[PDB]
Amino acid sequence: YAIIKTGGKQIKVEEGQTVYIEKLAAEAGETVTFEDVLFVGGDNVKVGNPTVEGATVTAKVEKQGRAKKITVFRYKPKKNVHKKQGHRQPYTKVTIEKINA
Amino acid sequence: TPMANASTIERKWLVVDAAGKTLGRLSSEVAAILRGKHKPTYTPHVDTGDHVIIINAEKIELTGKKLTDKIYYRHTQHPGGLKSRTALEMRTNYPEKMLELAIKGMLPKGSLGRQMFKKLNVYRGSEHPHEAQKPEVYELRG
Amino acid sequence: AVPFRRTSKMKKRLRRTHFKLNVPGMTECPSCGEMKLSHRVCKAC
Amino acid sequence: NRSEVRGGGRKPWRQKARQGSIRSPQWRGGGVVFGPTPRSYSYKLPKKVRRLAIKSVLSSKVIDNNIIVLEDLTLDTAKTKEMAAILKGLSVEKKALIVTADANEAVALSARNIPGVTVVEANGINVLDVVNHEKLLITKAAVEKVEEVL
Amino acid sequence: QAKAVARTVRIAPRKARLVMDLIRGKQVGEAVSILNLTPRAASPIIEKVLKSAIANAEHNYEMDANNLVISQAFVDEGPTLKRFRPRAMGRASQINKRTSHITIVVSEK
Amino acid sequence: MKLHELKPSEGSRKTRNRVGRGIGSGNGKTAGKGHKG
Amino acid sequence: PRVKGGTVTRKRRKKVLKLAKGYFGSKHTLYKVANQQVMKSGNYAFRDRRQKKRDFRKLWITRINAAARMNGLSYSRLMHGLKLSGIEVNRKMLADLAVNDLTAFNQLADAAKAQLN
RNA sequence: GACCGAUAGUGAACCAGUACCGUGAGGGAAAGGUGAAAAGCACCCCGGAAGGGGAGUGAAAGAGAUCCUGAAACCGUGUGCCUACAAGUAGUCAGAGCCCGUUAACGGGUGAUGGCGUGCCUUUUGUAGAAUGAACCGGCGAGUUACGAUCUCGUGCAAGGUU
RNA sequence: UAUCCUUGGGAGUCAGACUGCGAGUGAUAAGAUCCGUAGUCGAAAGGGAAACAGCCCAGACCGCCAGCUAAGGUCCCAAAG
RNA sequence: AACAGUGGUAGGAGAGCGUUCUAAGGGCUGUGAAGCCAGACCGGAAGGACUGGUGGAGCGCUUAGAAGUGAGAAUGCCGGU
RNA sequence: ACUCGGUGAAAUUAUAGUACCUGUGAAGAUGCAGGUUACCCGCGACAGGACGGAAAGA
């Protein structure tokens, strides 16, 4: 299991599990690859300076979606200030493949 | 994905000997143990602490002149009904309550804090009846 | 002596919890099968 | 109005204060604040604008091939059946406008009952009945009259 | 299962529910005795409705009078009559004469 | 110009400003007249 | 012409009353109080979507402190050592997982110890 | 009739200047809808009756006489989850357990515990206040029109334009 | 560095409050007394000062269970010696 | 595309959502219209669909036009509770 | 008055799961901060608070 950094954030992944990333472009069916692997734990552990040199985690794209809607509502008492807005944050569903080379 | 703990909590029993120790310096560490701050699986709402037995409660130490000028008050409910007694009387006659008052005051307020306090046992003397729980010996860090 | 505020439903229902009736004390008449209050009369029973 | 509703003079209240009128606009009784009022909606355009508009509509209908120029439209008998046969002969299946020179009566009586046909004379044509009706039937004399008027 | 309803009965619903709570769930034969021996003014009315329900169960659905139990029993609100001037003797105003709908259902256990 | 495809000349018609119909339009409570003035 | 209007009012109030589902007593029944509660909930939700990011970091720091003191260090010394070794890229969140699920992360504490000398 | 459609439109769609109020001059309401057709429930059963349950008529009887549709407040019956050591503008974020299974969606219901959190409106330099208003629900309830003045935009024609 | 001039249309506003500097003022230290002069609130949420319109840091388009700091802090409540 | 920006009361400016009616084109609907009830759907907001129940005869889409044009506060008025 | 059977109103009412103390605060804190107490639900009394009404100085 490695520790990737994708969306200005880090995740811990093991082969076969499904993860949700930030948009991450790409298209359903494509095979994405991550370069910044910061730690490869397991039997042999490879703590790496900045990033473990020569470490890549492949993965497969399943869908590009948007999460459940959030209704952002704010107001100020006594001042007649209202503001309503909707938000659905895009994501990407990805399945982890071979967590080395 | 962070692991919150529930029904997986496993507690231990520790014995702390309060012979040559200061009231506040011991109570802080004991309350931290009771709240579970020393465990990697600590979660803020499920009380992951463990049990603490304190012996030799009558040997606690107070620096300065606290043994004469530290007063313990209590107001029952009646208006103006405020009674008091000095720390010398408290340590000579009610040591256990004196330790409990400090440790309770260092604990969070609410239901979880009261449960955490329920996890504490204080005994004057040198013997405790909890040999069936096979407790260990814990040394204060500082 | 003026109600400062209206009473909520839950408090009304809570106050009305002791305002209920009791099952009577009834025995069956030796002759017949009529039911009467205990220690009451029913030869016609 | 709040003053044209029956009653309302006295201040409704008394005692054993007195404020308002049972006919104020916020009462169930009556009193409408502004509401509609009888007025005319008509106005006028410059004459050159009217001439340009009618000419534009006529030319537009010319472009779409929705114009049929008939030598003459005469009816020996004033029968609705004969107008229906004539209209079918020219392949006019929808709303149509017929323009005659000086309002002959046999054509006016026929096609009066046909649900999509309107008959006018040369000096009666205007923007609405030209735009509205899909097709335009006009006699050669009415063409001359319209051309010489404009 | 059999049902019997009494509509617009001249009784306040809150006072009828006191007895309705007593009798619901009981065996149908025992319930009649409780109604006969309770000293309330809703008992006679509820007893009439219960007897009517038992009758329908035998004459219309051919179920036996034994092996019968009270399944549902509730009281609803009926149209209210408003007496605006109890000025007669009373110094009150707009008295409300309330009303009830009494329903009883029985079935075989 | 068909009667179901009428288009005004661009810029000849402006929508009237209706005052006093909510705080989201900017002309709500005080109706554009502000406070006492 | 005249315009009556009842349907728009009913629908607009029903939306709010449906959003107020689950509140206590009158606050899921009457429109006037349900509206106030829904507005308050919107404000609270914004504020707490910020406070959540505030709070999970606090939890992570607490767990790291505990697991580090299980090794002879404190949180501050361990973080300084980790940053001084470039391995600090590793987060606090990921560190905390590797504290409840693999205390063999002590490897990282050993690296920080080596760099702190 | 780019007029209303039963709180509207006449005060009055209904035995309305009626009922009511006042000594009198005078003031002045509320109240429309079975069904295509009464075919408007023979007969049986409980009940003094009222009212029901069958049977029957009917497309419909949950269309049975204030009988089209029938919302909300308000009042009840049953049940899934929680609740008798707990201090609260009642939610919000984190969160086990239990119960479900959807417009399949990083699902629905309830929530033991932890953090944060002094209603809405008006007004004021400033409000959580011992400033003000609202018992709750529903309906109705406020920047128009005419004639002048002026400015911008559009269209037509232009030293001319218009009745 | 990107503002400022003219013309035209539309306005709102006319009891402001507190804090710090001065040393104009009892020119001195003032307090006064106003005078200036700057800031904040009004119209500004967020962190700190236990709580706190006007003090300190700092100006919220919206999401994230990412990182670095400001004022202020690191025995326990309560994050960190 | 590359930068820069997006707190806000009085107030100024801009873009839109819904309601009734009218005109033109297109349609729905007794194999079930409007209205009412429920739902875990869609849009940046005002809002809009789709399924199921009830209902038992009318309604909506596109482009224009006209307004008795949108309610939580008036010790509002009327009704119900 | 109280218990039982019958009948049955009014002023008031933003919603409300509505402790106490010491502070803070635009008037006086239940609802702000810190602490201390408190199993759930009633019936009868008191008059302390009642931001109840009377009052009235002024």
Residue numbers in the entry:
A (entry chain R): 2 to 102
B (entry chain J): 4 to 145
C (entry chain b): 2 to 46
D (entry chain E): 53 to 68, 73 to 206
E (entry chain S): 2 to 110
F (entry chain L): 1 to 37
G (entry chain Q): 2 to 118
Sentences reproduced from the published study:
YsxC (YihA in Escherichia coli) is a 22 kDa essential GTPase in Bacillus subtilis. Depletion of YsxC in cells leads to the accumulation of a 50S assembly intermediate known as the 44.5SYsxC particle. YsxC binds in the body of the 44.5S large ribosome assembly intermediate, occupying the site where uL2 binds and controls the timing in the folding of rRNA helices forming the binding site for uL2. Overall, these results suggest that YsxC serves as a placeholder factor for r-protein uL2 and provide the first example of the involvement of such a factor in the ribosome assembly process in bacteria.
In this experiment, we incubated the 44.5SYsxC particles with YsxC in a buffer containing GMPPNP. Importantly, none of the three maps contained density for uL2. Instead, they showed an additional density bound in the uL2 binding site that resembled the crystal structure of YsxC. Class 1, representing the most immature particle, captured the majority of the particles (89%). This class was structurally similar to class 1 in the untreated 44.5SYsxC particle sample, except that YsxC was now bound in the previously vacant binding site for uL2. In our study, we used the cryo-EM map of the YsxC-GMPPNP-treated 44.5SYsxC particle class 1, which had the highest resolution, to explore the binding site of YsxC in the ribosomal particle at the molecular level. We discovered that YsxC inserts itself into the binding site of uL2 and partially occupies the location of H66, preventing this helix from adopting its mature conformation and becoming visible. Consequently, simultaneous binding of YsxC and uL2 is not possible. In its binding site, YsxC contacts six of the rRNA helices also contacted by uL2, including H33, H34, H35a, H52, H55, and H58. Our cryo-EM structure of YsxC bound to the 44.5SYsxC particle mimics the GTP state of the enzyme since it was obtained in the presence of the non-hydrolyzable GTP variant, GMPPNP.
